[PDB]
Every structure is written in structure tokens, then in C-alpha cells.
Amino acid sequence: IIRRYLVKQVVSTSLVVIALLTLIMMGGRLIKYFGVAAQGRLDAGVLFSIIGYRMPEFLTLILPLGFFIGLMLVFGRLYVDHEMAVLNGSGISRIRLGQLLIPLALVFLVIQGILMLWMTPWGLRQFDQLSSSQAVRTGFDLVRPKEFISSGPYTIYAGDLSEDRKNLKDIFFYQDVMILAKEATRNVVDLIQGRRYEIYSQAEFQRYRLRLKVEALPSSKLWNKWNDPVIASEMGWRVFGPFTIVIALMMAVALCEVSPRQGRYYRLIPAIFIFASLIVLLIAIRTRISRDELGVWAYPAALAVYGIAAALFSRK
């Protein structure tokens, strides 16, 4: 009954923290993408697809961090409202409570394995294809109101633009062909009340039509080829990465002892920084393996170093 209680508490608060961190860490990147779209370098109607295809990639960091914070929130709550004094006072240690959550940690580890081995590579593949599709936009796609945008041999000025990137006003286009149009709607673009000049040919017209990665490879293709340092780094990251939920279990147990006056959220920031240090080491090691300087053996050791150091801290 203690195990079901702890599992329910951790699942609820960890889902809350995972949703909140997903919102915080995807809204910022979506705002950056929206700024890019407002600058005309990205379709505003596709940025939601961009952030939806990077759902797994962000979740592979939110899940280890969300679980870590949820574990901290539960254990800190137990300490603050004296539910840990009676649990320790009944013969159930904090380490025993952490071990009671091993099945839940294994469930989240299976989930993160699903994300990092299948879901994240697929999301990265789709996002790379979409970005390649959106990296070729040029011409009136990139125009901004009251500004001159230069793309290749094209120079474009628009005096006005609608909320969507259509229905341009006061359009000046330079190649040499120079076209000044009163209106333009969108590369296939219909210009209205325009003049075309060649620098010397002149043509007025009422209307005119102008016509100017390893991270995403499937795990099936990366299971072999461990000799390649880049492939080895990526595949070891995909294999030894989901084991950050086991290190987020035995370390959140170690760094959760807070006094009732100290607060439930007091120790979050230092231990969140410790987990961030673990992940930063796991990324520097990944890069070093990608450069053929360290070898895959550093993936488990970097965990074990944090696995042991946390465990010792839990048994001091």
C-alpha cells in the first residue's frame, strides 16, 4: 500500500512536471520559430508541425528531468509534512522507498528507450525533411514590409503585407528586369497594376504572372557499424541514454532530504543542476566519441560514476 501510494504520487507529480517542462521548453523554441516565420524565413502554418516532429527529441530530456523533479517533489513533500519521519520511524528507510519505485523507473526506462531508439530518430528524420523543404524558400516568400530583401539575383521591396504572407502592396522587384506593381498576391505571384523595365524596354500591364544526418538514421541501420566513431557515438547514446532514468532514481533519492521549514522546492535547483551536469557530461562524451577520441566505454562509466556517487550519498 506504501508502494501504490508512492507510485501514484510520483506518477501524478511527474506527469504534471513533464507537461509543465514540455510547455516551458517547447514554447520558447516555438516562439523562436515564430520569430523566424515573422521574418519570412519560415512558413507560419508549418511551425506547429516543426514543434510536433521535435516532440520526441525534447521529451528525451524532459522525461529524465521530469521524473527527477517528480521524485524530488514527492520525497520533499514526504519530508516536509513529516510522512518520512513516520515511515523511517516504522522501519522503512528512504532507500527502501526508492527501491519500491524500481518498477516505475523501469517503466519510464522502457518508455525512454522507445523514444530514443525509434520515436526520436523518426521525429528527427521528418523534421530534417521538413526543414530541407523550408530551407529552399526564396523570392517573394522572404519579403518583409518596408524593407529590401536580397535573395540571389533578386531584390524585393514591399510597402505593405497582410497578416499572412500574401497580398503585397507597393512592390519593387529588381534582377536586369525591374518590375514595380501596385499589388501582388502569392514562386508563382500575380502582380496587379504593374510596370516592367529592362535596362531599355518598357511594358505596362494591368495583371501579370511572375515565375522567379546520423541523428535521424533508424536504429536498425545503426545497430551494426560500431566501428564508425559517429555511428558508434549515436548508437551508444541511443542505448546508454535511456539509462538516465535509473540514475535519476537513485540520485533524486540521495538529494531529497529537506527540513519541513526548508521547503519542498528548496533542494530542486542544486540537484537539477547536478542532473544537468550529468547530462552535459553525457553530451560532451557523445561529441568526443563522435570525434573518435574517447570510445563508447565512456557511456556506462559516466552513468556509473553518477550512479555510485549518488548511491554513496544515499548511504552516508
Partner 1 sequence: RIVAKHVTKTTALAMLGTTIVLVILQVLFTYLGELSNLKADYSAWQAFLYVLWGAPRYLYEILPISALIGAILGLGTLASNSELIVMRSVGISLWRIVGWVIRSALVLVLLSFALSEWVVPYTNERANSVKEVRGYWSREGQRFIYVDYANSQGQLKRIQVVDFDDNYRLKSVTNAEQGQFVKDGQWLLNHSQQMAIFSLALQPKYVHMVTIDPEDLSFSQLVSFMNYMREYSQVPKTYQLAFWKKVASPFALITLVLVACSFIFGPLRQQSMGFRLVIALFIGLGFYYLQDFLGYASLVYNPSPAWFVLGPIVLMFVAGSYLLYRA
Partner 2 sequence: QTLCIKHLAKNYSKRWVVKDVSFEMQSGQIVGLLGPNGAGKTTSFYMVVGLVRMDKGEIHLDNLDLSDLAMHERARKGIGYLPQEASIFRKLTIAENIMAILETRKDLNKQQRQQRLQELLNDFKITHIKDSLGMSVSGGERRRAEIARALAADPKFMLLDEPFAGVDPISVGDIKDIIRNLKDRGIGVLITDHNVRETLAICEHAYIVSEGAVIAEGSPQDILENEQVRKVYLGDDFT
Ligand X SMILES: CCCCCCCCCCCC(=O)O[C@@H](CCCCCCCCC)CC(=O)O[C@@H]1[C@@H](NC(=O)C[C@H](CCCCCCC)OC(=O)C[C@H](O)CCCCCCCCC)[C@H](OC[C@H]2O[C@H](OP(=O)(O)O)[C@H](NC(=O)C[C@@H](CCCCCC)OC(=O)CCCCCC)[C@@H](OC(=O)C[C@H](O)CCCCC)[C@@H]2O)O[C@H](CO[C@]2(C(=O)O)C[C@@H](O[C@]3(C(=O)O)C[C@@H](O)[C@@H](O)[C@@H]([C@H](O)CO)O3)[C@@H](O[C@]3(C(=O)O)C[C@@H](O[C@@H]4O[C@H](C(=O)O)[C@@H](O)[C@H](O)[C@H]4NC(C)=O)[C@@H](O)[C@@H]([C@H](O)CO)O3)[C@@H]([C@H](O)CO)O2)[C@H]1OP(=O)(O)O
Q: Cβ(30)–Cβ(42) under 8 Å?
A: no
Backbone angles phi, psi at 253, to 5 degrees: -70, -35
Which range touches ligand Y75 (CB under 6 A), out of 28-36, 150-158, 282-290, 302-310? 282-290
* Residue 135 sits in the site that holds ligand Y75 (CB under 6 A): no
Please tell me the count of residues contacting partner 1 according to CB under 8 A.
41
* Residue 22 sits in the site that holds partner 2 (CB under 8 A): no
Which range touches partner 2 (CB under 8 A), out of 81-89, 150-158, 196-204, 294-302? 81-89
Q: Cβ(60)–Cβ(112) under 8 Å?
A: yes
* Residue 114 sits in the site that holds ligand Y75 (CB under 6 A): no
* Residue 1 sits in the site that holds partner 2 (CB under 8 A): yes
Q: Smallest gap, in angstroms, from Cβ of residue 218 to partner 1?
A: 25
* Residue 312 sits in the site that holds partner 2 (CB under 8 A): no
- Among left, alpha and beta (phi > 0; psi -120 to 50; other), residue 12 is alpha
Q: Quick one: what does residue 215 bind among ligand Y75, partner 1, partner 2, none, with the CB cut-off 5 to 8 Å set by partner type?
A: ligand Y75
Strand partners, 203: 196
B/e letters for 1-24, b = 16+ CB within 10 Å, e = fewer, are eeeeebbebbbebbeebbeebbee
* Residue 24 sits in the site that holds partner 1 (CB under 8 A): yes
Using CB under 6 A, which of 24, 31, 110, 280 touches ligand Y75?
Answer: 280
Nearest Cα neighbor of 235 from 275, 306, 290 is 290
Cell 561529441 maps to which residue? Answer: 287
* Residue 288 sits in the site that holds partner 1 (CB under 8 A): no
Q: Cβ(247)–Cβ(260) under 8 Å?
A: no
Binding site for ligand X (CB under 6 A): 21, 24-25, 28-29, 32, 36, 57-58, 60-61, 64, 241, 244, 272, 276, 279-280
